[PDB]
Amino acid sequence: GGATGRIVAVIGAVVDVQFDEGLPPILNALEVQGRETRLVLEVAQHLGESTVRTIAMDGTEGLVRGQKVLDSGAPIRIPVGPETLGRIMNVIGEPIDERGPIKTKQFAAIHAEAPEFVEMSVEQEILVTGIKVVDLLAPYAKGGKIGLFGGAGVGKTVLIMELINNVAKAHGGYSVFAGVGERTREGNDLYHEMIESGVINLKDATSKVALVYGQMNEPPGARARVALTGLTVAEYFRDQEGQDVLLFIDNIFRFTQAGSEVSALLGRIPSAVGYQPTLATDMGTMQERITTTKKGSITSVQAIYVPADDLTDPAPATTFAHLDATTVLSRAIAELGIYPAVDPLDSTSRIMDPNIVGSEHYDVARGVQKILQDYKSLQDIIAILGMDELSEEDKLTVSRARKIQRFLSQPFQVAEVFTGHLGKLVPLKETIKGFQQILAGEFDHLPEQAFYMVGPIEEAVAKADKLAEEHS
């Protein structure tokens, strides 16, 4: 069955293992023995004779040269099934919530092929997530990949927690959260939030979300294989159960960065900015497996870090290429005080089409984007000269633009600790009606301070009336 070979060279993940009789194929799971915890290595390149270049997933400390390694002869088989809901696991398949082992029946392998072109769903139902900036300018696709770009401290995680606490209540389909390279603090808070919110249930077999965590304390081989873990769990729940799953993968730049760290150790020539040459195709296979198919639906919201706010970096650029709804959770609009600081110009969605979202939503959205682009040109002129150089047309555009730009902001339910407001769930027709009134210009007398952290437009009218009454 297995083949016993010998470690002869060790760098992190990159462990050159010598096989002389039983060399295994690429993408294999072979365990190092003599260890406290099972040290699953992953066979890649055979380089010389004997030389499987494995990537090592755990504590590399203590790997003596010439050490015996048992090759199991398969890719990384992990537990899947309905026995993994409400149960944390890490990339080997091991349960790390100390409740016991997985009592499932079948294993699914971490490494698989994408669904072919022959069977692909082409239907697009609008996912309305109760957020004004999303449902107005880049509305989500129920059955398409959704991406939350942004820098450090821009509100990606808070927006994910809004997306769980808003959409995950609706889908009866089994959700899957995959944390890759993020804070273990956030995975802990999310696990206790899923316990208290009833989304998982530690006394019954009727929990709803599975959890995979490969957090940022992990060596790079581990973090390069977490998205694959949570994705083959959610790919089981798509294929052989037929459910409408959600897949919340935070933060896919950690996957790509762990790939770059391993590849810098793997002896491949460095590509552009400092990444690997296989940035397009490794992320290509991993993103093509995240797809809605005929057999079932995936709605996959994934948070995608950008390094040093560069959208021209290769990993965010190819991730813009691999998506159906982007949302550029910028930072400068949070310097202005708007939370989430979603750049809505650079955020688009594939589903915005007048033959899909209707003519009213499309006209309101494109008018909002027009007013904000005219405001960007005019804020160049304003930043140099001032607002006393503009005409009546230009000043009405600037005033309507600041009103709209404050009205895009809303308070979320999960970020009620930072702000003071409660969680506002804005329906779709109230978003269209509010932005349509502000765009048509019926509110040329309310202050712009009355549209900040508001929600529905009647709350904006009430905030202006309460502001005038407290000034009375």
Binding site: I26, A44, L47, V118, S271, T285, E288, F320, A321, T348
Partner: protein
């Protein structure tokens, strides 16, 4: 069942023959150093024993770097690699029409096998200065902005360069959806066989693209060739050469063909992956040296053929994205340098309001008025000169430098023609309606008419002219030139419609 039986047992010859092989060294990441093939020829399709092709590049005295066409798990160290015996080739026919074909020849769409007849080598040499003749036919796209400022020639290459998410693939699909009315017509010279090579995209975008083309009934010009993200880097590398070879088949038979190379930068980055894995030295932005030679072969496979060589044309239009609008990057400078026509989208006009978002003066078509109809040439040259005047006077009089009657005339005509050039997605119009509407815009009759009202003017004007003026548009499109009686008739109809527009 029984027919399946007999085709299985008669089709495979099982004709064993002694054959050159060689064992495999390091099978790294889709690259395989193969020791032994001392008679392999450079850039040759070779075959790994698990049933999968690879392409032999980088012939060295040690070993041959074969780069695989697909997955890497299915290859070990020490297995055979059989020479197929010929350069990698693409099966081309006219029964390949309307069928999504994976990058070599393998039709992965679930509609049976391809009924090909004419195998063709994919790395062929492009025609020389004698077999080519110049652009003559007006390659129309249905976009008002393209066909009135940067017109395409049947015989030509013309970029669609922009930044991400601007409307470039949408311009390419407007170009595709226009040519239905020329396929189902009468003249063979008008008819279209196009090849949409989608490089490095995602499979659901190609699936919804095929949905839009089938719902628009596009599947007789079209040949969609998908080398998506999950495909290997040589499938993404080799896919636009395959579409070029299919276009060369149609061209050398004498049928007017085109190829849209969607996301050609993905070919550039897949070939960067291939060179850096085959250990070639990196050049600039880690792209190697011959990326310009790559795209230069790929894009100079297209110009009009001589009248003694069938008369078939090829129109190469590759789509390329920059990052942050940086035209000075390596791949945009190379691919601007090889092409001549290029359509520039800046994106700030997409968020400002014009669709399709050609931001313009950067965009140029070197074949110019030679690739227009006679009517559009008679109308839309003064439009381009007026837009140049308008852009420069608005650029220095941003603040109101000097406003005489001439400057407000320039800004009035410029803003009104700017709202002429707006056009909705997936709605291409024919050349005669374009001549009619740019006649209504440039030759007076719209200069003092409240620029927000131009779009309803467009809708009601096209409704009017399609309502009771179909034979006159037939006269315009079949006579070529817009005649003087048709000129004064268009003057009278636009005056009557100005009355009915202020009615």
């Amino acid at each position: 069942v029984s027919s399946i039986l007999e085709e299985r047992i008669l089709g495979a010859d099982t004709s064993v023959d002694l054959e050159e092989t060689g064992r495999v060294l390091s099978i790294g990441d889709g690259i395989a150093r193969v020791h032994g093939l001392r008679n392999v020829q450079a850039e040759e399709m070779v075959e790994f024993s698990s049933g999968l092709k690879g392409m032999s590049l980088n012939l060295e005295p040690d070993n041959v770097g074969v780069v695989v066409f697909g997955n890497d798990k299915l290859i070990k160290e020490g297995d055979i690699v059989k020479r197929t015996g010929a350069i990698v080739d693409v099966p081309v026919g006219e029964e390949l029409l309307g069928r999504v074909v994976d990058a070599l020849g393998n039709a992965i769409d679930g509609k049976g096998p391809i009924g090909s007849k004419a195998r063709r080598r994919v790395g062929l040499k492009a025609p020389g200065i004698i077999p080519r003749i110049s652009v003559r036919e007006p390659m129309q796209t249905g976009i008002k902005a393209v066909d009135s400022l940067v017109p395409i020639g049947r015989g030509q290459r013309e970029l669609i360069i922009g930044d991400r998410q601007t409307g470039k693939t949408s311009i390419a699909i407007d170009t595709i959806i226009n040519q239905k009315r020329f396929n189902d017509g009468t003249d063979e010279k008008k008819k279209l066989y196009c090849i949409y090579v989608a490089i490095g995209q995602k499979r659901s975008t190609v699936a919804q693209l095929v949905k839009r083309l089938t719902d628009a009934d596009a599947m007789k010009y079209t040949i969609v060739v998908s080398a998506t993200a999950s495909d290997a880097a040589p499938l993404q590398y080799l896919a636009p050469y395959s579409g070029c070879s299919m276009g060369e088949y149609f061209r050398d038979n004498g049928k007017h063909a085109l190829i849209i190379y969607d996301d050609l930068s993905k070919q550039a980055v897949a070939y960067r992956q291939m060179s850096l894995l085959l250990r070639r030295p990196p050049g600039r932005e880690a792209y190697p040296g011959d990326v310009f030679y790559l795209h230069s072969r790929l894009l100079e496979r297209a110009a009009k053929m001589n009248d003694a060589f069938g008369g078939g044309s090829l129109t190469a239009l590759p789509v390329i994205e920059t990052q942050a609008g940086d035209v000075s990057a390596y791949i945009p400078t190379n691919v601007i340098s090889i092409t001549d026509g290029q359509i520039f989208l800046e994106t700030e006009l997409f968020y400002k309001g014009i669709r399709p978002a050609i931001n313009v003066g950067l965009s140029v078509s070197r074949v110019g008025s030679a690739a227009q109809t006679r009517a559009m040439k008679q109308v839309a040259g003064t439009m381009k000169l007026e837009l140049a005047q308008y852009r420069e006077v608005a650029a220095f009089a941003q603040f109101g430098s000097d406003l005489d009657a001439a400057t407000q005339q320039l800004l009035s005509r410029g803003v009104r023609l700017t709202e002429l050039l707006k056009q909705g997605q997936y709605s291409p119009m024919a050349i005669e309606e374009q001549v009619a509407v740019i006649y209504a815009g440039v030759r007076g009759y719209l200069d003092k008419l409240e620029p927000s009202k131009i779009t309803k003017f467009e809708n009601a004007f096209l409704s009017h002219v399609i309502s009771q003026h179909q034979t006159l548009l037939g006269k315009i499109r079949t006579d070529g030139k817009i005649s003087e009686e048709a000129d004064a008739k268009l003057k009278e109809i636009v005056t009557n419609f100005l009355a009915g527009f202020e009615a």
